[PDB]
Design an enzyme around this catalytic site. Structure first.
Site, PDB file in Angstrom:
ATOM      1  N   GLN A 105      19.140 -11.203  52.685  1.00 64.25           N
ATOM      2  CA  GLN A 105      17.965 -11.905  53.222  1.00 64.25           C
ATOM      3  C   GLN A 105      16.720 -11.024  53.159  1.00 64.25           C
ATOM      4  O   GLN A 105      15.604 -11.514  52.966  1.00 64.25           O
ATOM      5  CB  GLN A 105      18.212 -12.375  54.655  1.00 64.25           C
ATOM      6  CG  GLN A 105      17.028 -13.104  55.232  1.00 64.25           C
ATOM      7  CD  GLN A 105      17.264 -13.604  56.630  1.00 64.25           C
ATOM      8  OE1 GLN A 105      17.827 -12.899  57.474  1.00 64.25           O
ATOM      9  NE2 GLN A 105      16.809 -14.815  56.901  1.00 64.25           N
ATOM     10  N   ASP A 108      15.689 -10.933  49.506  1.00 63.96           N
ATOM     11  CA  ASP A 108      15.144 -12.223  49.142  1.00 63.96           C
ATOM     12  C   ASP A 108      13.729 -12.331  49.647  1.00 63.96           C
ATOM     13  O   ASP A 108      12.875 -12.826  48.971  1.00 63.96           O
ATOM     14  CB  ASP A 108      16.053 -13.395  49.614  1.00 63.96           C
ATOM     15  CG  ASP A 108      15.368 -14.766  49.575  1.00 63.96           C
ATOM     16  OD1 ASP A 108      14.312 -14.858  50.150  1.00 63.96           O
ATOM     17  OD2 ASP A 108      15.874 -15.778  49.052  1.00 63.96           O
ATOM     18  N   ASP A 110      11.533 -10.051  50.161  1.00 64.77           N
ATOM     19  CA  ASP A 110      10.648  -9.138  49.466  1.00 64.77           C
ATOM     20  C   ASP A 110      10.152  -9.825  48.193  1.00 64.77           C
ATOM     21  O   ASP A 110       9.027  -9.659  47.788  1.00 64.77           O
ATOM     22  CB  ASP A 110      11.454  -7.900  49.050  1.00 64.77           C
ATOM     23  CG  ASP A 110      10.598  -6.782  48.479  1.00 64.77           C
ATOM     24  OD1 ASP A 110       9.729  -7.027  47.631  1.00 64.77           O
ATOM     25  OD2 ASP A 110      10.820  -5.623  48.865  1.00 64.77           O
ATOM     26  N   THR A 184       4.877 -10.745  46.365  1.00 62.28           N
ATOM     27  CA  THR A 184       4.965 -10.140  45.049  1.00 62.28           C
ATOM     28  C   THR A 184       6.363 -10.145  44.456  1.00 62.28           C
ATOM     29  O   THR A 184       7.297  -9.664  45.053  1.00 62.28           O
ATOM     30  CB  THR A 184       4.446  -8.688  45.075  1.00 62.28           C
ATOM     31  OG1 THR A 184       5.344  -7.869  45.819  1.00 62.28           O
ATOM     32  CG2 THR A 184       3.075  -8.624  45.723  1.00 62.28           C
ATOM     33  N   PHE A 186       7.824  -8.334  42.707  1.00 62.23           N
ATOM     34  CA  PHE A 186       8.434  -7.015  42.562  1.00 62.23           C
ATOM     35  C   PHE A 186       9.189  -6.509  43.796  1.00 62.23           C
ATOM     36  O   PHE A 186       8.802  -6.785  44.921  1.00 62.23           O
ATOM     37  CB  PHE A 186       7.362  -5.960  42.225  1.00 62.23           C
ATOM     38  CG  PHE A 186       6.568  -6.255  40.984  1.00 62.23           C
ATOM     39  CD1 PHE A 186       5.268  -6.753  41.072  1.00 62.23           C
ATOM     40  CD2 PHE A 186       7.136  -6.071  39.725  1.00 62.23           C
ATOM     41  CE1 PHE A 186       4.556  -7.066  39.929  1.00 62.23           C
ATOM     42  CE2 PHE A 186       6.425  -6.384  38.572  1.00 62.23           C
ATOM     43  CZ  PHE A 186       5.137  -6.882  38.674  1.00 62.23           C
ATOM     44  N   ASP A 188       9.183  -4.180  45.852  1.00 62.05           N
ATOM     45  CA  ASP A 188       8.211  -3.164  46.216  1.00 62.05           C
ATOM     46  C   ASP A 188       8.017  -2.906  47.692  1.00 62.05           C
ATOM     47  O   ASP A 188       7.107  -2.168  48.084  1.00 62.05           O
ATOM     48  CB  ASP A 188       6.872  -3.573  45.586  1.00 62.05           C
ATOM     49  CG  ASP A 188       6.409  -4.969  46.030  1.00 62.05           C
ATOM     50  OD1 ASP A 188       7.150  -5.633  46.781  1.00 62.05           O
ATOM     51  OD2 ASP A 188       5.300  -5.394  45.633  1.00 62.05           O
ATOM     52  N   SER A 190       7.343  -5.124  49.963  1.00 61.42           N
ATOM     53  CA  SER A 190       6.216  -5.921  50.405  1.00 61.42           C
ATOM     54  C   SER A 190       6.443  -6.383  51.832  1.00 61.42           C
ATOM     55  O   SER A 190       5.508  -6.484  52.617  1.00 61.42           O
ATOM     56  CB  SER A 190       6.036  -7.134  49.492  1.00 61.42           C
ATOM     57  OG  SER A 190       7.164  -7.315  48.653  1.00 61.42           O
ATOM     58  N   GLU A 258      12.849 -14.500  62.307  1.00 59.48           N
ATOM     59  CA  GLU A 258      13.601 -15.734  62.265  1.00 59.48           C
ATOM     60  C   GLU A 258      14.926 -15.633  62.958  1.00 59.48           C
ATOM     61  O   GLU A 258      15.342 -16.554  63.579  1.00 59.48           O
ATOM     62  CB  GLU A 258      13.815 -16.200  60.836  1.00 59.48           C
ATOM     63  CG  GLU A 258      14.690 -17.431  60.686  1.00 59.48           C
ATOM     64  CD  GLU A 258      16.041 -17.119  60.192  1.00 59.48           C
ATOM     65  OE1 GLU A 258      16.224 -16.004  59.750  1.00 59.48           O
ATOM     66  OE2 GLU A 258      16.920 -17.975  60.200  1.00 59.48           O
ATOM     67  N   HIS A 351      23.186 -18.358  52.521  1.00 60.90           N
ATOM     68  CA  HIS A 351      23.331 -19.245  53.650  1.00 60.90           C
ATOM     69  C   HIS A 351      24.779 -19.444  53.977  1.00 60.90           C
ATOM     70  O   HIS A 351      25.165 -19.528  55.156  1.00 60.90           O
ATOM     71  CB  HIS A 351      22.657 -20.577  53.352  1.00 60.90           C
ATOM     72  CG  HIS A 351      21.150 -20.494  53.301  1.00 60.90           C
ATOM     73  ND1 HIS A 351      20.387 -21.503  52.857  1.00 60.90           N
ATOM     74  CD2 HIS A 351      20.280 -19.473  53.661  1.00 60.90           C
ATOM     75  CE1 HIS A 351      19.095 -21.149  52.926  1.00 60.90           C
ATOM     76  NE2 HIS A 351      19.030 -19.907  53.420  1.00 60.90           N
TER      77      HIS A 351
HETATM   78  C1  HEM Z   1      18.375 -18.470  59.956  1.00 66.64           C
HETATM   79  C2  HEM Z   1      18.457 -18.011  58.484  1.00 66.64           C
HETATM   80  C3  HEM Z   1      19.232 -17.044  58.010  1.00 66.64           C
HETATM   81  C4  HEM Z   1      20.232 -16.118  58.790  1.00 66.64           C
HETATM   82  C5  HEM Z   1      20.697 -16.435  60.037  1.00 66.64           C
HETATM   83  C6  HEM Z   1      19.025 -16.980  56.586  1.00 66.64           C
HETATM   84  C7  HEM Z   1      19.659 -16.166  55.729  1.00 66.64           C
HETATM   85  C8  HEM Z   1      19.493 -15.999  54.367  1.00 66.64           C
HETATM   86  C9  HEM Z   1      20.290 -15.124  53.503  1.00 66.64           C
HETATM   87  C10 HEM Z   1      21.544 -14.233  53.955  1.00 66.64           C
HETATM   88  C11 HEM Z   1      19.792 -15.246  52.234  1.00 66.64           C
HETATM   89  C12 HEM Z   1      20.245 -14.561  50.908  1.00 66.64           C
HETATM   90  C13 HEM Z   1      21.263 -13.717  50.765  1.00 66.64           C
HETATM   91  C14 HEM Z   1      18.687 -16.196  52.315  1.00 66.64           C
HETATM   92  C15 HEM Z   1      17.901 -16.603  51.215  1.00 66.64           C
HETATM   93  C16 HEM Z   1      16.838 -17.525  51.257  1.00 66.64           C
HETATM   94  N1  HEM Z   1      16.510 -18.300  52.354  1.00 66.64           N
HETATM   95 FE1  HEM Z   1      17.463 -18.272  54.128  1.00 66.64          FE
HETATM   96  N2  HEM Z   1      18.102 -17.895  56.211  1.00 66.64           N
HETATM   97  C17 HEM Z   1      17.719 -18.548  57.344  1.00 66.64           C
HETATM   98  C18 HEM Z   1      16.787 -19.552  57.326  1.00 66.64           C
HETATM   99  C19 HEM Z   1      15.972 -20.012  56.258  1.00 66.64           C
HETATM  100  C20 HEM Z   1      14.961 -21.072  56.300  1.00 66.64           C
HETATM  101  C21 HEM Z   1      14.589 -21.916  57.542  1.00 66.64           C
HETATM  102  C22 HEM Z   1      14.445 -21.184  55.086  1.00 66.64           C
HETATM  103  C23 HEM Z   1      13.360 -22.172  54.582  1.00 66.64           C
HETATM  104  C24 HEM Z   1      13.917 -23.193  53.628  1.00 66.64           C
HETATM  105  C25 HEM Z   1      12.933 -24.218  53.116  1.00 66.64           C
HETATM  106  O1  HEM Z   1      13.128 -24.762  51.957  1.00 66.64           O
HETATM  107  O2  HEM Z   1      11.964 -24.501  53.904  1.00 66.64           O
HETATM  108  C26 HEM Z   1      15.107 -20.185  54.246  1.00 66.64           C
HETATM  109  C27 HEM Z   1      14.868 -19.945  52.930  1.00 66.64           C
HETATM  110  C28 HEM Z   1      15.460 -19.043  52.067  1.00 66.64           C
HETATM  111  C29 HEM Z   1      15.004 -18.795  50.688  1.00 66.64           C
HETATM  112  C30 HEM Z   1      13.848 -19.330  49.816  1.00 66.64           C
HETATM  113  C31 HEM Z   1      12.606 -18.407  50.020  1.00 66.64           C
HETATM  114  C32 HEM Z   1      11.412 -18.965  49.380  1.00 66.64           C
HETATM  115  O3  HEM Z   1      11.136 -18.633  48.196  1.00 66.64           O
HETATM  116  O4  HEM Z   1      10.768 -19.786  50.046  1.00 66.64           O
HETATM  117  C33 HEM Z   1      15.936 -17.788  50.166  1.00 66.64           C
HETATM  118  C34 HEM Z   1      15.797 -17.300  48.736  1.00 66.64           C
HETATM  119  N3  HEM Z   1      16.033 -19.488  54.973  1.00 66.64           N
HETATM  120  N4  HEM Z   1      18.517 -16.650  53.621  1.00 66.64           N
HETATM  121 CA   LIG Z   2       7.726  -8.088  46.719  1.00 67.86          CA
END
Ligand code: HEM
Ligand SMILES: [Ca+2]
Ligand SMILES: *[C@@H]1O[C@H](CO)[C@@H](O[C@@H]2O[C@H](CO)[C@@H](O)[C@H](O)[C@H]2NC(C)=O)[C@H](O)[C@H]1NC(C)=O
Ligand SMILES: *[C@@H]1O[C@H](CO)[C@@H](O)[C@H](O)[C@H]1NC(C)=O
Ligand SMILES: *[C@@H]1O[C@H](CO)[C@@H](O)[C@H](O)[C@H]1NC(C)=O
Ligand SMILES: *[C@@H]1O[C@H](CO)[C@@H](O)[C@H](O)[C@H]1NC(C)=O
Ligand SMILES: C/C=C/c1ccc(O)c(OC)c1
Length: 595
Positions: A105, A108, A110, A184, A186, A188, A190, A258, A351
């Site tokens: 998370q 992700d 970053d 970003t 990258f 990095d 962020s 969160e 998730h």
């Molecule tokens: C509560 C939430 C988490 C933990 C208790 C949790 C966890 C993760 C992990 C372990 C991920 C990857 C290994 C991961 C990736 C991405 N998430 Fe998720 N996450 C929780 C809650 C949310 C919520 C709310 C959102 C928003 C979803 C939407 O469509 O509105 C969410 C998103 C994402 C996401 C997309 C990021 C982006 O580019 O917007 C991951 C790549 N997570 N989470």
């Molecule tokens: Ca970044």
């Protein structure tokens, strides 16, 4: 073709060519096309967006309009039928620590964020969508199917607003709608420092000239720092408990609070930065504020790159890791380092890895107090359980001694997230992360499952028998078919995650391919990759080669017993060793012999 470069929201692209540091916005990494991998630009489209009207509308917006001859299922109906489960027994991943889920998370965050449409100021729209469930413009409610428990206690829908898109905030034509990545592309760091200068500076401590990151002045963790509070009202961290009145934290990334464990990992990062600027001060007393900040920032972004690429990715991709991420061969200016739109969904695999509870542990890694183990939903935007309840050291122990949830075909997502998710400005712990994900796929005009299977050089099943053979599951195939009526319609998120895990890995072929490509692209298209010759010195690289998450814990917490391999499952006291026997990050290679 398209207008070669729509770009009304991004104007300033002035680059200093000597600069030895990454800009906060990501800009100027790529010299030929600077805006590549920069915050606030469109997510890349590896494949043409697939929209109901072929412009901005999502499939499932017009009831009459079908996708490939069939109506697409409700996001929540898919969720209930396939995603949900009751029994939390035998669901823990035997070989992965809870840290594994947490790091996923962090990384992700970053890389990508596509925040919602900001068009309501002194407007009841956030409530007109929620209160009367009427789809319009950006409001795209997740409706409840017929047989749904939530229909009985919540209403007709779950509020959902469409993501932001480049150029016009609300109206545009005729080119396909492109969502924004607000951070970003990258790796990095962020999420620690910010992706905007406006935020970047606020996070910094400019009072002293020690290049430290601004910390908390209202509370401490046994002399150790907490990230500063964000004083913006309304805060959901205060809303969850109105008696404790503890607001959310302020970090380089918006989503830091969160869940308590992410906020926790965010606290570990700030510390290691401050700890780094203090050591640089001692060896290089002549170095000024900005320089101490920048060099520390440089080292932290390198740390995140080594952990993610050396320790984390091989255990997500496993056998498929070399196929996609073959040893580093240096910076390649032709490589696009932008995060693609589908990766923001591929990565959601995490998730499935989230377990239903979180624990607190004492020095012997035993339940810390009477309520030591808590349900996950009581931790969404809960910063008080850290301040008023024992700091991070107990939580950082849970993360080492507990397990991540194992993805499971009949137990994909826990109810804590499926039914009990809290979302700001909405009161209830009654949301569904699964439905949301599927809604978002459609919102981002995502191509269906087979488009993506074809994209990866894999087969495209058209029958129940075909799908059965790919998923190696009769009943999963049947439920999906009954809902989708064709694979071609299966939303990428549930399709990618439905596939059995690759050997020595935690995702299937389709995701290992998508995740695979993206990560290699962000390593190869990064002018400031820690191993790119000339970024760090030959000696500095040998010092960085020794970093570990164990070391990050010892260095920034009062724990003195940690495993050697933080991501695999580890039991106390056997798999644990003293911090004494752990490689340290020696910073001598950073000595500045200026005279
Ligand atoms: C509560 C939430 C988490 C933990 C208790 C949790 C966890 C993760 C992990 C372990 C991920 C990857 C290994 C991961 C990736 C991405 N998430 Fe998720 N996450 C929780 C809650 C949310 C919520 C709310 C959102 C928003 C979803 C939407 O469509 O509105 C969410 C998103 C994402 C996401 C997309 C990021 C982006 O580019 O917007 C991951 C790549 N997570 N989470
Ligand atoms: Ca970044
Ligand atoms: C709100 O936060 C308060 C304050 O931290 C929590 O109150 C405490 O919890 C238990 C009592 O059940 C005690 O260990 C603490 O001493 C309490 N503090 C105070 C000031 O009362 C309370 O449990 C939280 N409430 C909710 C609903 O989350
Ligand atoms: C656990 O994972 C590690 C890699 O992270 C691997 O070396 C080890 O063999 C695994 N254990 C089992 C029983 O598969
Ligand atoms: C800034 O740094 C000084 C010197 O270390 C410290 O005393 C002060 O508390 C810091 N301010 C903030 C907001 O972090
Ligand atoms: C650089 O990227 C291009 C375009 O994707 C690719 O063809 C080439 O193989 C890469 N260069 C190296 C040295 O790998
Ligand atoms: C603050 C809100 C928020 C927090 C964590 C998330 O993962 C998220 O979705 C992108 C939104």
């Amino acid at each position: 073709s398209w207008e070669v470069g729509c770009g009304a929201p991004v104007p300033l692209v002035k680059c200093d060519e000597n600069s030895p540091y990454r800009t906060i916005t990501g800009d100027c990494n790529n010299r030929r096309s600077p805006a590549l991998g920069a915050a606030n630009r469109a997510l890349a489209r590896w494949l043409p967006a697939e929209y109901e009207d072929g412009l901005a509308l999502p499939f499932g917006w017009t009831q009459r309009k079908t996708r490939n001859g069939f109506r697409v299922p409700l996001a929540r109906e898919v969720s209930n039928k396939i995603v949900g489960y009751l029994d939390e027994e035998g669901v823990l991943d035997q070989n992965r620590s809870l840290l594994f889920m947490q790091w996923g998370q962090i990384v992700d965050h970053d890389l990508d964020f596509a925040p919602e449409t900001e068009l309501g100021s002194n407007e009841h729209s956030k409530t007109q969508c929620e209160e009367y469930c009427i789809q319009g413009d950006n409001c795209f409610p997740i409706m409840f199917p017929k047989n749904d428990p939530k229909l009985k206690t919540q209403g007709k829908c779950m509020p959902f607003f469409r993501a932001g898109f480049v150029c016009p905030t609300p109206p545009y034509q005729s080119l396909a709608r492109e969502q924004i990545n607000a951070v970003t592309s990258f790796l990095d760091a962020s999420l620690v420092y910010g992706s905007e200068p406006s935020l970047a500076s606020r996070l910094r401590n400019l009072s002293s000239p020690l290049g430290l990151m601004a910390v908390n002045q209202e509370a401490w963790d046994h002399g150790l720092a907490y990230l500063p509070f964000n004083n913006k009202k309304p805060s959901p961290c205060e809303f969850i408990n109105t008696t404790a009145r503890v607001p959310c934290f302020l970090a380089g990334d918006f989503r830091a609070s969160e869940q308590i464990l992410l906020a926790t990992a965010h606290t570990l990062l700030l510390r290691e930065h401050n700890r780094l600027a203090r050591e640089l001060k001692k060896l290089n007393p002549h170095w000024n504020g900005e320089k101490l900040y920048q060099e520390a920032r440089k080292i932290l972004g390198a740390f995140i790159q080594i952990i993610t690429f050396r320790d984390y990715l091989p255990i997500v991709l496993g056998s498929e890791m070399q196929k996609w991420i073959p040893p580093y061969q240096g910076y390649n200016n032709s490589v696009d380092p932008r995060i693609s739109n589908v990766f923001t969904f591929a990565f959601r695999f995490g998730h499935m890895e989230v377990p239903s509870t979180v624990s607190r542990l004492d020095e012997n890694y035993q339940p810390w107090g009477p309520e030591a183990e808590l349900p996950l939903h009581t931790l969404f935007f809960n910063t008080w359980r850290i301040i008023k309840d024992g700091g991070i050291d107990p939580l950082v122990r849970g993360l080492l001694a507990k397990k991540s949830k194992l993805m499971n075909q009949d137990k994909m997502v826990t109810s804590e997230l499926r039914n009990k998710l809290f979302q700001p400005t909405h009161k209830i712990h009654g949301f569904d992360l699964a439905a949301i994900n599927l809604q978002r796929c459609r919102d981002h005009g995502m191509p269906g499952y087979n488009s993506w299977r074809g994209f990866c050089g894999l087969s495209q099943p058209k029958t129940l028998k075909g799908l059965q053979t790919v998923l190696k599951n009769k009943i999963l195939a049947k439920k999906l078919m009954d809902l989708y009526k064709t694979p071609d319609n299966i939303d990428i998120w549930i399709g990618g995650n439905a596939e059995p895990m690759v050997e020595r890995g935690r995702v299937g072929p389709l995701l290992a391919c998508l995740l695979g490509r993206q990560f290699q692209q962000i390593r190869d298209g990064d002018r400031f990759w820690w191993e790119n010759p000339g970024v760090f010195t030959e000696k500095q690289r040998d010092s960085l080669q020794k970093v570990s998450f164990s070391r990050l814990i010892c260095d920034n917490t009062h724990i003195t017993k940690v495993p050697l391999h933080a991501f695999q499952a580890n039991n106390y006291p056997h798999d644990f060793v003293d911090c004494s026997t752990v490689d340290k990050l020696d910073l001598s290679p950073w000595a500045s012999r200026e005279n």
